[PDB]
Design goal:
17% of the residues lie in helices and 26% in strands. By secondary structure, it is of the alpha+beta class. It has one domain: SRA-YDG (PUA domain-like, Roll). It is globular and about 55 Å long. It starts with 17 loop residues before the first strand and ends with a helix. The protein binds a DNA duplex through loops. It is classed as ligase/dna. The entry lists the keywords base flipping, Developmental protein, DNA damage, DNA repair, Metal-binding, Nucleus, Phosphoprotein, Transcription, Transcription regulation, Ubl conjugation pathway.
Length: 201
DNA sequence: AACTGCGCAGTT
DNA sequence: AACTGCGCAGTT
């Protein structure tokens, strides 16, 4: 199958693919966590992440976007620490990891990060799909740093620039590779009838 | 001075 | 709940 600490693209899953649920995304091996937004080890790096909404500063510009770390409680109580996934995402960036933040002198060498976009990010991003989840290729960490929210507590911000050959599925060439490849929304088996039987009664 | 086990806890 | 890092703890 596909090792869990596997960085990079999943063979058999092209960009522009769309599963209706997160469970399907995990099943596919593109983002294992059934609910969490990022997957990775403190000692290895981040393998994948999905976009929901959260922070209001998080700008999604398509080819690049910024992300916010997690933790700070157990509701903001303590300023986030560079441990766990916060740290793991920090490794994908190609520079010696540092407490005050860091910017890669050459971001392209950093470890790849599979990025999926959920439709819950529609309000904010004009790139999030209408419904479900869509795989938009590889993004590498360019730089990360720590800000201080309106809650006076530091939070870890990151900037991801795309870097996958295959064209963004929201562009002309993208929407083309899709058709050629015939990619369509995917529902779990038995889901559509289950959904049907809901509406009835 | 440490091996080790029951245990609170943050992260996902 | 599962899994981890490991105080504080009673055992070696």
């Amino acid at each position: 199958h596909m090792p869990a600490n596997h960085f990079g693209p999943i063979p058999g899953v092209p960009v522009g693919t769309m599963w209706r649920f997160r469970v399907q995304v995990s099943e596919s091996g593109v983002h294992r966590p059934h609910v969490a937004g990022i997957h990775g080890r403190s000692n290895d790096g981040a393998y994948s992440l999905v976009l929901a909404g959260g922070y209001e500063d998080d700008v999604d510009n398509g080819n690049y976007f910024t992300y916010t770390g997690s933790g700070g409680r157990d509701g903001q109580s303590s300023d986030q620490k560079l441990t766990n996934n916060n740290r793991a995402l920090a490794l994908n960036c190609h520079s010696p990891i540092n407490e005050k933040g860091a910017e890669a002198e050459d971001w392209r060498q950093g470890k790849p990060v599979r990025v999926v976009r959920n439709m819950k990010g529609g309000k904010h991003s004009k790139y999030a799909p209408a419904e479900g989840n869509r795989y938009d290729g590889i993004y590498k960490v360019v730089k990360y740093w720590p800000e201080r929210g309106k809650s006076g507590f530091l939070v870890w911000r990151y900037l991801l620039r795309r870097d996958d050959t295959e064209p963004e599925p929201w562009t002309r060439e993208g929407k083309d590779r899709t058709r050629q490849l015939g990619l369509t929304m995917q529902y779990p088996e038995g889901y559509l009838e289950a959904l049907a039987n809901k509406e009835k009664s």
